[PDB]
Symmetry: D2
Subunit: 310 residues, 4 copies
């Protein structure tokens, strides 16, 4: 497999590149940056190679500028982590829709691939990448409410005193304040947490608000999330690599699977495999959660229109 990370010079880009080179199935890895940042990537290449030596891993890392994206040909996934530093949730959306749109257009002129969008707003940037690439919807997806579901997993596991991996929850909709945390998909060991001791003392609304404000807290404290997002990305790349056909949650295009909702890219239950988003699974939603998903689809559609012509 060959994966090209556009934005490898950044925080998430560099972490994703190192974790990706370690991945056994990743043979070739193309690190793409703006020409000015290319030296930062040279030092990433060296650093990653050193880690590969101390990880019993190997990869052909390959550092290029963004000038000619023909270096991404043969790549099965092009992870776009490139984003301007932040200026509202709409303003950065116009700047980053410019960036992601140009990257998707040029990538599509060069080859056919799966575009993994990490730039924020991730649902709007995934929609912009799909629009400008003219790629089929199975090929363009963004890491969205999955990172939120991982932060939720942490909160639940720490409260219930279990290995973080034993918790498995799902949050759909916008990677933002209009999240739709599915408490019916929240379980420790496959057992719904409502049926577990002390769920009555679980501060769910506090925990969900904290989950919503965790990205901001990490920006304010360290300067931005890097390892959490990067690990979440390696999961998706591994699913695509080994055709694992897994029910995951990704920002993908809806075309009537869930309540006839179309013309948007939002967090949805999807079956990921070698062909990207193979199907948007229409999981049965409670009435209150389905309403919240409709609302997040409304806000995301408004934002998507504000950058459709960018």
């Amino acid at each position: 497999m060959k994966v090209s990370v556009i934005g490898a010079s950044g925080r998430i880009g560099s972490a994703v590149s190192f974790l990706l080179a370690k991945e056994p199935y990743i043979k070739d890895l193309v690190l793409i940056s703006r020409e000015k940042s290319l030296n930062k990537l040279k030092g990433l290449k060296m650093d990653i190679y050193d880690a590969l030596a101390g990880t019993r891993s190997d990869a052909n890392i390959e550092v290029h500028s963004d000038k000619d994206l023909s270096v991404v040909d043969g790549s099965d996934i092009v992870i776009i982590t490139a984003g301007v530093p932040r200026m509202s949730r709409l303003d950065l959306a116009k700047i980053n829709a410019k960036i992601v749109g140009n990257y998707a257009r040029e990538i599509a002129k060069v080859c056919d691939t799966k575009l993994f969008i990490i730039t924020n707003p991730v649902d709007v940037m995934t929609y912009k990448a799909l629009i400008e690439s003219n790629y089929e919807r199975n090929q363009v997806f963004g890491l969205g409410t999955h990172l939120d579901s991982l932060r939720f997993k942490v909160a639940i596991a720490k409260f219930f005193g279990v290995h973080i991996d034993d918790v498995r929850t799902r949050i759909i909709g916008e990677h933002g304040d209009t999240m739709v945390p599915l408490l019916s998909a929240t379980s420790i060991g496959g057992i719904p947490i409502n049926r577990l001791p002390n769920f009555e003392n679980f501060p769910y609304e506090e925990v969900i608000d904290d989950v919503k404000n965790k990205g901001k807290k990490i920006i304010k404290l360290k300067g931005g999330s890097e390892f959490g997002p990067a690990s979440a990305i390696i999961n998706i790349v591994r699913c695509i690599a080994n055709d694992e056909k897994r029910l995951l949650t990704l920002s993908a295009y809806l075309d009537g699977e869930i309540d006839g909702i179309r013309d948007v890219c939002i967090g949805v239950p999807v079956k990921v495999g070698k062909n990207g988003i193979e199907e948007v699974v229409p999981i049965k939603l409670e009435d209150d959660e389905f309403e919240a998903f409709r609302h997040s689809v409304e806000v995301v559609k408004e934002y998507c229109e504000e950058v459709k012509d960018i």
Copy 2:
């Protein structure tokens, strides 16, 4: 961690010895068998060693007989996979086997006993009584194996990676299972809230699970790799103190409806101290009743093999 396997010459025993030797935490593995089978273990130690050479692993594998169980001293866990393949007959014969091994082990050291011998929910109770060990240290691999088989059948009907399925079965490792369809979820999403669940043949699936052990015994001769890997998950949770909610044959002292004096498959939080608590999950109505029925039948068998 030092783990001793009693019955390593068997199907499950040899598979579990190879897998445990590969585990990084396992530093000392003590294989044990009847003297008449000790040579089969001497070969096993060799073959596993070569496997360790080709898996980047290392382990100090000692091979001994069951005549001096002092070799199990220092064993964090002792996995008893020893036993012969009439139900009350297998419970009585394997109860002599497991009870003797537990008594002798308890005279050597204070370890945790992982009973794999069948009837597992009864051999686990026999091990606990004949050891006098604290309840938290004796546990058995019961409904967990059945839950992995159910996991397979679901993951194939719904066309997902098996590991995206996560289910749970409680009660007896036997025809009185209590499968928790309310605790069956793909991606955390209950199957009841998933497309095509209507056409999921739950009843056929659970019946095939009930007899999958007998069908492997008929086709291959006995479950070897499935049971072994299931053992390694428990050994890992104990070694790394993962404090995970699993399902094991464990002693009940009233955590679930005052049910006591029974070792049965239950939700248990497992860590460095074996069974750390019997978590009383809120069961459904039909489920809790099939669980009291499984506790009833299992208590019958435990009585039938108490004077053994």
Copy 3:
């Protein structure tokens, strides 16, 4: 990746199937046996599925007899473990088995043939000829396993992790082995330079490495976990195009001292396309002479089975 295991009902074939399904790249695994063992395979498929559920792995296992080998088409690799277990007579018996299998596999598709049947060098040669496959596509697990056994012996005498040891044995998987002390290392450090090499019983250890197969057969009934894990390493090298310098039974076409028309254990670069290169390392005169003798006997046995 799709791999077919021809001979999966066997001891080695079953361990190889369980480990191959557990691998993340193996998406399809086609287990093939004679009709008389097809049921044994359908319980292996079940048993492995149960392990895959307990190993967070998944795969699509397909069980078929050897009657119609069209079930192997699409395989990147076909691992032939089918073979009468254990001299020249065994070569003839298994040359018929391997020759017919390679003939019918080559009539079904073009694939890589990983040959485990013994005499592995001779059987790899017979597979190459009877399939008319390219020489980069046919290879066997030969002296690599001897090197892993030498690895165990060295690591134990020197008190180091088994994986810290790295040695090379070339030539035949047998009594014409050519152990290369010049390549035996610990941490990359040649063992001669290490402390206490003067006390290492090299000749006794190599004699033991040669007879280790015979001893595992006498004590347990045949090697399975060692050879299976070794096979996994080779399959993984192909599946990830690791381009690792390994030792495998491969066809020589003059890379080493103009030695040709033989499939013998040699240093090769394994990758996506199989034997990408036979690397002619600098062998001492003594080692090279032993390699020439080994090649001689292997060619004698290869001629004795040239029409079988």
Copy 4:
């Protein structure tokens, strides 16, 4: 296992915390920082936790400051990545004097709390490891640094990218100082176990150029990206794994010598060390060639001079 990373707010420290949290044997991870960097660690703990949610891992990350180091009590290892940024206007002696006080104060206060292993990453790593062993008054088997091992992995990268081989198939050793007095052991350099002198095309290996590159690779990574993080962090994890699972592996680390090599004593320098549950369990005295052994004597002499220069800091 409980590992305390002092200096986790940095590049090496944060990378190492993330990897250690993922390690299955790490149950407690204590991240320590200056009081002005504690927020940078509370963001780190969160980020790593999210990573542990997406890596099927779990750990109890506790975030404290360097004021009270009674928080590291119970640690099997304390990895000190604390160090000053090497500004261009800083000599070797200047950074040695600056980081000798940092490492010495941390060693003294960590010893006042408990008895643990001190994994020194701060450069000059040999001199800092020596200062930490001295000011901790610990057993010499318990204090050890990451030195020529990283230079060895970089040599491995340069070898495996020249010979067209997987990186892990190359195994080489560099002993001596994590610096210009390095002693690369071409005797201990191999591919698949085959010494590389016995390999096709060793004639054209630019070994001397390669070694000068491996000697300046850290400086180049600093110039380009700002400092290595993943290389040293992964190497650190390898050492922690050998200690935790008692693998008894022959590694190369900065360790104290008490005569194992030609009566060379009173120096923490890069040497072959069998690492296990008890840190440096033996300094293995491998048979170095004459030129190699002279170069090692030289590296020891220079490192002893650096140590005398920071003996009273």
